[PDB]
Design an enzyme around this catalytic site. Structure first.
Site, PDB file in Angstrom:
ATOM      1  N   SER A 117     -52.938   6.177 -17.624  1.00  0.00           N
ATOM      2  CA  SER A 117     -51.660   5.615 -17.185  1.00  0.00           C
ATOM      3  C   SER A 117     -51.358   4.350 -17.998  1.00  0.00           C
ATOM      4  O   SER A 117     -52.131   3.391 -17.975  1.00  0.00           O
ATOM      5  CB  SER A 117     -51.672   5.327 -15.710  1.00  0.00           C
ATOM      6  OG  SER A 117     -50.478   4.673 -15.305  1.00  0.00           O
ATOM      7  N   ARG A 118     -50.225   4.365 -18.707  1.00  0.00           N
ATOM      8  CA  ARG A 118     -49.855   3.317 -19.656  1.00  0.00           C
ATOM      9  C   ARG A 118     -49.318   2.088 -18.910  1.00  0.00           C
ATOM     10  O   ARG A 118     -49.495   0.962 -19.371  1.00  0.00           O
ATOM     11  CB  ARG A 118     -48.848   3.865 -20.673  1.00  0.00           C
ATOM     12  CG  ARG A 118     -49.436   4.936 -21.580  1.00  0.00           C
ATOM     13  CD  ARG A 118     -48.672   5.145 -22.870  1.00  0.00           C
ATOM     14  NE  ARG A 118     -48.948   6.461 -23.432  1.00  0.00           N
ATOM     15  CZ  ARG A 118     -48.688   6.821 -24.684  1.00  0.00           C
ATOM     16  NH1 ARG A 118     -48.327   5.914 -25.574  1.00  0.00           N
ATOM     17  NH2 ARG A 118     -48.787   8.090 -25.040  1.00  0.00           N
ATOM     18  N   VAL A 119     -48.662   2.315 -17.767  1.00  0.00           N
ATOM     19  CA  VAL A 119     -48.178   1.235 -16.904  1.00  0.00           C
ATOM     20  C   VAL A 119     -49.385   0.602 -16.199  1.00  0.00           C
ATOM     21  O   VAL A 119     -49.589  -0.610 -16.272  1.00  0.00           O
ATOM     22  CB  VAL A 119     -47.122   1.740 -15.901  1.00  0.00           C
ATOM     23  CG1 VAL A 119     -46.709   0.655 -14.917  1.00  0.00           C
ATOM     24  CG2 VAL A 119     -45.901   2.308 -16.610  1.00  0.00           C
ATOM     25  N   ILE A 142     -46.812  14.142 -25.595  1.00  0.00           N
ATOM     26  CA  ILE A 142     -47.849  13.148 -25.284  1.00  0.00           C
ATOM     27  C   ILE A 142     -47.450  11.790 -25.883  1.00  0.00           C
ATOM     28  O   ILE A 142     -47.611  10.754 -25.236  1.00  0.00           O
ATOM     29  CB  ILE A 142     -49.231  13.624 -25.783  1.00  0.00           C
ATOM     30  CG1 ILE A 142     -49.757  14.800 -24.953  1.00  0.00           C
ATOM     31  CG2 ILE A 142     -50.234  12.479 -25.807  1.00  0.00           C
ATOM     32  CD1 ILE A 142     -50.814  15.622 -25.655  1.00  0.00           C
ATOM     33  N   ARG A 165     -40.886   3.647 -27.597  1.00  0.00           N
ATOM     34  CA  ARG A 165     -40.327   3.655 -26.254  1.00  0.00           C
ATOM     35  C   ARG A 165     -39.450   2.415 -26.050  1.00  0.00           C
ATOM     36  O   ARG A 165     -39.853   1.293 -26.365  1.00  0.00           O
ATOM     37  CB  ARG A 165     -41.443   3.687 -25.204  1.00  0.00           C
ATOM     38  CG  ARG A 165     -42.315   4.932 -25.250  1.00  0.00           C
ATOM     39  CD  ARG A 165     -43.540   4.807 -24.372  1.00  0.00           C
ATOM     40  NE  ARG A 165     -44.375   5.999 -24.438  1.00  0.00           N
ATOM     41  CZ  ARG A 165     -45.209   6.283 -25.434  1.00  0.00           C
ATOM     42  NH1 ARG A 165     -45.380   5.421 -26.422  1.00  0.00           N
ATOM     43  NH2 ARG A 165     -45.847   7.438 -25.449  1.00  0.00           N
TER      44      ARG A 165
END
Ligand SMILES: Nc1ncnc2c1ncn2[C@@H]1O[C@H](COP(=O)(O)OP(=O)(O)O)[C@@H](O)[C@H]1O
Ligand SMILES: Nc1ncnc2c1ncn2[C@@H]1O[C@H](COP(=O)(O)OP(=O)(O)O)[C@@H](O)[C@H]1O
Ligand SMILES: Nc1ncnc2c1ncn2[C@@H]1O[C@H](COP(=O)(O)OP(=O)(O)O)[C@@H](O)[C@H]1O
Ligand SMILES: [Mg+2]
Ligand SMILES: [Mg+2]
Ligand SMILES: [Mg+2]
Lengths: 481, 451, 48, 469, 114, 119
Positions: free
Chosen positions: D335-337, D306, B173
């Protein structure tokens, strides 16, 4: 002379070479070698045994007029070489005039003798249950980090018989650590190390087993005994799959070519026990296969299982639970069997397999203590202690006379008084005592190859005396009742 | 000069004059109707060269001129690379040049490493300790916690180290790259770190070679300057993925599970270059994706062979809320022997594994019947096993935004002593919640009183 | 006496469950092999 | 330049001529139907048709436009229903917009981004608390059919009453109409663009539908304005691309998909980002959807998306049927954030909420198989927390209302009250605070934090209400 | 709740909840049975089984198959029936009473015969 | 067949292992360029087997009694290879280790072993 038309992915199509032989060694103009596999109508499909970065369209290729051959001799002992037979260790050149072809026919039906000579691995689990004879092929199969390579290294250390450790698709640092392990033990002097690491092309991996076999055959035909180790054929199969798919050969089951079984067949069969007429030399094989999630049913495993003379299935569950080596007793088998065992081991470990087969059946009941009768309780207590004897630490091969005594102890029920957790230490200290004081008992077993009635009564007294001396680690001590 | 004949996605076929055909892996430039860099792959015949594009092939036309550089893709090297951001081609993204393609070191030059790299994490140090100059692998499924772990290992180890580092964002990313940039900027560790980026945005051509560019830079820091270098690759799978994408379009027949036939070969050439030599050593912390949570898949299956230590992240442990979610049984380390790490550490490590293994075996029986049918001994083992599972969980320095509380670092001596007391059963009285998400033994007892 | 009966049935049910799953496993095992090969051969025929 | 069609069928056409044609160039057939030159062969040009191909034949003349795929953009699209090409289907006049953007554009670079630290409130307690979504983040909504995937996206769009872009791929027309009707009722259509590539349309439209919706959103993004895009769904768009590739005779891989099926979703989603202060500081949040089969997360296309997105919200059928609605599996969803995409008020109260509920579900299973005091309290707490996370359809709650509801449960104010009466307790409590203690809500709105005064205020308000309840 | 009203929606989901829990316990019931389940679960399983069998109905087309003539049940009868089943008003009645019946009168009529 | 036909006597045929013929059949089938069938076997699996097994039969003159060994891949009797073979066969003799360990020779399992003609 011929000219390259197409090139890429370690493959080259060649114009010309009209009377080229099949599997003939070709030489590109940069000094890189190749192998003519597919002789087409108006082209010659060649696999490159080296870097192909400076191999292009228009480059000139010449004939050698020779089918793949590799030098052989005593010079290779204690050396590290590639499939072609060039030393990588950097300890001078290999002085040997004698050469052998890679592709040679295995001994015929008449040119063999029945295997009746033990090859001691030095591992209690193997030697007792799944014995390996001189000329036998015993598969070592299981998942990653189950102790497949460890068994082979321990076997090589115990021969201190010429050894040939063939490494296919291995990382360099692993091969270095294996070499280091042999140096520490002092088993490198009689060990040849063929290495076709991951960086090398598919051709090297494909050839690696055949080169190692050819080296061993030199000793075999001269009337000397050899042990070869393929680590592993799973990667060599994957390498051949790559080559075949690049040459545009039609795939089958699991994207493998039709002759993937045939690949392993010719290799393993060359391992045999020759007749008395042809010297009576041997060449034992320890091929390895890497299963995925303990999948024995897979294509490549099933192929090799059907070729080899018994298998030693290692399990992950057993390994993690503490059983090391993690050999599954029920599934693992030796096709030669008692023939590849000395009479001493045959007698003591004749009904060891039966007792442990009963134990696993009973095992369920063990948790529910004192809810059973007397007979079953004794079998569980016996079985549990037998498991602890079969456990063995890494890089510690035991002599055959030491094994028979250790098994005789457990089977006769000399460890029944001692706690289960203290069995391992009891075994170690006992052998030290017998080594020092009662060497005559070991010497007797070495010479006669049987346990005498005198030796039996001697051992009983030695055990009883030691039990009194032995301080139990956990809780109070107990000698006899 | 050449002329474009055929275009099919990132694959481009070029004609050249008989006898002046570019060599393999040579960089070819072509003007867009920007400059597109193509790299030679195959020789089709009749002076046709099939090439892989290193940037989008949108705007190209048939018959456009293609210039031959006469060499492979070059990338910058030296101290100037430190505190900068680059792409696969080796151009500055923050506004001597050697070829990326090169043979690996000889067997004589390769050294076996047997030195402990103390992470600070209890699960790693005990069950799967990493090696200095080794190859470490974070195996994990889809969106499990690979990047969070690699960021942790950077945060913990890198600051204290006087050696330089090289990060390689292979097919990940661009947002995370921006987050990393600011994280390194605040810590003031940008100066001793080189960054290379070939994110998922870019075609497969980039993701293929981007790993080589970053590796080449690291190799020179190793060889010439004589430095202990760190190499962070995230994610190594995406190279293999990119390998499959190009393989299909080139017209190679696919292998098992639709991968390229030269999967092991491609990987082999890359991984073998990443090694610690007698002269100078390199510690490679790689991240590895596991498709379909399937370790039997050829991609992760092949990678396992190259690695000295391995950390297998499982979804089952992640679902419980155990961070980091390292599978204690599956995960392994080569150095875990009585020779290197001493008899005590080896004894405790294996004894912990024994307890967790038996617990996993009884899961099926406990699911139906429960705890009641188990014996007095088994009842205690299950109780200890559950407490051991929860003690393996630990606060991460990187995970302040996630958890809330700050991270904790646990020395080796504290780790060994802790699991020693747990196995003996000295903390049988304490509740299960006391073990959850704690570092030191003092913090266990402090939280025990509050509950 | 009641446990004997209860656990006897449980064992008989377990036997039945094993047989049903084993068939389902072999169904999948054969299918996965058949499915993979068809995709591989499908790609091969696409070219030539 | 001019070309002639040699072969035609299945929405594909081989063209003779067009010697200097660009890759992915827009071509025009003589009936007015458009096409896209993908494969530039030696003596032909493989073209995919973006329309009906019933009157496209061998011998028909095709012309060059001299342009790579582009679509008009602007404020005109707000409250309109359009196709991928950008033609209105609703029948409410033409789209007056001179500004245009290319479909295929490079996403923001590493340097041209800023860390996501701006909450995008869905108005759903389960999401906002446990799996928060920030401005520029990509949050996957994955699960089986009739699990409430579209419902979450619609509720999110209603709560923005930030520009919305609902992209419909392979959907039936009546569903898209009902979604439009839902937006009209709520009154959220005025700031919502609806891109629609229904099932009847060719594969080309489905393939393009996400890229067109993204391009529309990018116009606002670069101008320094915030956007939310919704792909419903990428599963069908993947299937559409599979069809095209197989027709063009591109070699298939896993699950009969082409090699660049991952690459398809990668370029799409990455364009969703949070720009730097230098480039305005605009955002473009993504809510992609994937339709799993029998809760198979392991499948090829799910695993692909994903691995791209910044966290996932896995919906389950078993939970949905059991009464947990929305049916978000707490353990699997992430949630990655994380806390960065939450206001300080929510961050404090719901700091370790996801961890506690992950432990609850583990213990719930183990509970079934005499317990102590500590574990019993956790189960009683956890059970009540689940009831708070339950939320009715088309009812987004304000952020200040959520924080109070979670603060109530987490601190253990519902422990005395039965589990079945938690839902009614929540509703009546919020009504009380809305009426009397609006200052507490107002404080949270402005400050985005719970003060020590506000904490003590709430405690007294709760205690007083409990007596009345 | 918009179209089919709150009551219908409430009963519909409540029926699904009971049948879902029953399906979850199938694995445990397969080995151990009903005995090991708790007092609450025992009742839920009993109700669930009775609900499953009440969902069965005689079809007008299926006269040749079954034998008995078909039955048509209005919406009001349907809602009221499943309301009483969920509350547990027909806990006394046997399992066979629910099998292949339309109206509530036919349940009680067949209950007496058995 | 010649010992059967001409000599006029009941001949024995011992085959070990019959599966490996079918296995070999798959190996050649792939290389010839035939598209594989179920579980990656040759499309002419039943045909190849049929031609072999049908020759092994009793004529008016005399018979041939075939004592075959059959491999079962993955212990899976549903596998096409062993599944097809079972159609041709009359009788089975299952030797067990439990009976061998007792010292009962021959160690034929009386329950597991079966024969079709037992009617
Ligand atoms: N009998 C044993 N006792 C204790 N440890 C062992 C034993 N056998 C192997 N090991 C250890 O376990 C590891 C197994 O890994 P490895 O030998 O690579 O297995 P494989 O070759 O099957 O991948 C080795 O690194 C070794 O240190
Ligand atoms: N939070 C909720 N509470 C109650 N019902 C819901 C909720 N979310 C969705 N539903 C209902 O469930 C059904 C499925 O919703 P939908 O979003 O269409 O799922 P999918 O997108 O998987 O088809 C719809 O009929 C909707 O009314
Ligand atoms: N050690 C941890 N502690 C807390 N949360 C974690 C941890 N590891 C992962 N997570 C959660 O799971 C997410 C997965 O992270 P990431 O590594 O980016 O996924 P991937 O494994 O696909 O690279 C994190 O962003 C975080 O929300
Ligand atoms: Mg090994
Ligand atoms: Mg990641
Ligand atoms: Mg939907």
């Amino acid at each position: 002379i011929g000219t390259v038309i197409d090139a890429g992915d370690g493959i080259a199509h060649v114009e010309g070479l009209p009377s080229v032989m099949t599997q003939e060694l070709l030489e590109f103009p940069g000094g890189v070698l190749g192998v003519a596999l597919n002789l087409d109508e108006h082209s010659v499909g060649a696999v490159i045994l080296g870097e192909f970065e400076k191999i292009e369209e228009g480059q000139q290729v010449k004939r050698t007029g020779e089918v793949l051959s590799v030098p052989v001799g005593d010079a290779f002992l204690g050396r590290v070489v590639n499939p072609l037979g060039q030393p990588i260790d950097g300890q001078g050149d290999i002085a040997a005039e004698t050469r052998r072809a890679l592709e040679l026919q295995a001994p015929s039906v008449v040119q063999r003798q029945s295997v009746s000579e033990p090859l001691q691995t030095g591992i209690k689990a193997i030697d007792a249950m799944t014995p390996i004879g001189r000329g036998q092929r015993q598969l070592i199969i299981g998942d990653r980090k189950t102790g497949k390579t460890a068994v082979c290294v321990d076997t090589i250390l115990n021969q201190r018989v010429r050894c040939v450790y063939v490494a296919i698709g291995q990382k360099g640092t692993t091969i270095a650590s294996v070499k280091r392990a042999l140096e520490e033990g002092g088993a490198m002097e009689y060990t040849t190390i063929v290495a076709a690491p991951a960086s090398d092309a598919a051709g090297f991996k494909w050839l690696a087993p055949y080169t190692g076999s050819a080296i061993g055959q030199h000793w075999m035909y001269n009337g000397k005994h050899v042990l070869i180790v393929f680590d592993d054929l799973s990667k060599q199969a994957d390498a051949y799959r790559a080559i075949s798919l690049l040459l545009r050969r039609p795939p089958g089951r699991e994207a493998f070519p039709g002759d993937v079984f045939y690949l392993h067949s010719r290799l393993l069969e060359r391992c045999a026990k020759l007749s008395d007429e042809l010297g009576g030399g041997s060449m034992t094989g320890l091929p390895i296969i890497e299963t995925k999630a303990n999948d024995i049913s897979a294509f490549i495993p099933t192929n090799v299982i059907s070729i080899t003379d018994g298998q030693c299935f290692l399990e992950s569950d057993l390994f993690n639970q503490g059983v090391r080596p993690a050999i599954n007793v029920g599934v693992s088998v030796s096709r030669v069997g008692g023939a590849a065992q000395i009479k001493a081991m045959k007698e003591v470990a004749g009904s060891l397999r039966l007792d442990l087969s009963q134990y696993r059946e009973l095992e369920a009941f063990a948790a529910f203590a004192s809810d059973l009768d007397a007979a079953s309780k004794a079998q569980l207590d016996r079985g549990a202690r037998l498991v602890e004897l079969l456990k063995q630490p890494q890089y510690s091969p035991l002599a055959v006379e030491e094994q028979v005594v250790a098994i005789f102890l457990g089977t006769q029920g000399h460890l029944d008084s001692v706690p289960v957790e203290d069995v391992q230490r009891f075994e170690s200290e006992l052998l030290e005592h017998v080594k020092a004081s009662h060497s005559d008992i070991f010497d007797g077993i070495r010479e006669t190859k049987k346990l005498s009635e005198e030796a039996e009564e001697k051992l009983v007294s030695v055990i009883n005396e030691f039990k009194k001396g032995f301080x139990x680690x956990x809780x109070x001590x107990x000698x006899x009742x | 000069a050449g002329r474009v004949v055929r275009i099919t996605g990132p694959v481009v076929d070029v004609e050249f004059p008989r006898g002046s055909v570019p060599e393999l892996f040579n960089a070819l430039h072509a003007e867009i109707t920007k400059t597109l860099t193509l790299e030679v792959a195959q020789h089709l015949g009749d002076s046709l060269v099939r090439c892989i594009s290193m940037q989008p092939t949108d705007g190209l036309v048939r018959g456009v001129e293609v210039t031959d550089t006469g060499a492979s893709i070059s990338v910058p090297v030296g101290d100037g690379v430190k505190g900068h951001v680059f792409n696969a081609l080796g151009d500055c993204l923050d506004d001597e040049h050697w070829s990326i393609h090169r043979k690996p070191p000889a067997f004589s030059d390769l050294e076996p490493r047997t030195e402990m790299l103390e992470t600070g994490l209890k699960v790693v140090d005990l069950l799967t300790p990493y090696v200095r100059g080794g190859k470490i692998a974070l195996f994990g499924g889809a969106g499990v916690g690979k990047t969070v772990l690699i960021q942790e290992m950077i945060n913990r180890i890198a600051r204290n180290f006087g050696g330089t580092s090289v990060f390689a964002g292979v097919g990940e990313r661009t947002r995370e790259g921006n987050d990393l940039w600011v994280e390194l900027a605040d810590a003031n560790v940008l100066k001793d770190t080189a960054l290379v980026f070939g994110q998922m945005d870019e075609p497969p051509g980039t993701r293929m070679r981007v790993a080589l560019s970053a590796l080449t830079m690291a190799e020179f820091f190793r060889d010439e300057q004589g430095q202990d270098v760190l190499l962070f690759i995230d994610n190594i799978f995406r190279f293999t993925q990119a390998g499959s994408e190009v393989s299909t379009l080139l017209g190679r027949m696919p292998s098992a599970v639709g991968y390229q036939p030269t999967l092991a070969d491609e990987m082999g050439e890359l991984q073998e270059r990443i090694t610690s030599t007698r002269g100078r050593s390199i510690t490679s912390m790689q991240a590895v994706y596991v498709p379909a949570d399937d370790y039997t898949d050829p991609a992760p299956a092949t990678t396992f062979a190259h690695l000295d230590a391995t950390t297998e992240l499982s979804r089952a442990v992640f679902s419980k809320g155990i961070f980091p979610a390292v599978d204690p049984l599956a995960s392994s380390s080569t150095i875990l022997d009585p020779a290197i790490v001493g008899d005590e550490h080896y004894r405790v490590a294996q004894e912990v594994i024994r307890i967790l293994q038996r617990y996993k075996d009884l899961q099926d029986i406990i699911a139906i019947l429960g705890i009641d049918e188990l014996s007095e001994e088994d009842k205690q083992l299950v109780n200890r096993a559950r407490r051991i599972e929860r003690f393996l969980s630990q606060n991460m320095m990187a995970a302040e935004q996630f958890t809330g509380q700050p991270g904790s670092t646990v020395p080796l001596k504290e780790t060994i002593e802790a699991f020693d007391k747990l196995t003996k059963g000295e903390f049988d009285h304490l509740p299960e919640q006391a073990f959850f998400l704690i570092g030191g033994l003092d913090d266990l007892a402090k939280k025990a009183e509050s509950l | 006496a009641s446990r004997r009966r209860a656990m006897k049935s449980a064992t008989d049910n377990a036997d039945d469950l094993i047989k049903a799953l084993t068939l389902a496993a072999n169904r999948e095992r054969q299918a996965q092999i058949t499915q993979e090969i068809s995709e591989i051969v499908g790609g091969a025929n696409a070219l030539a």
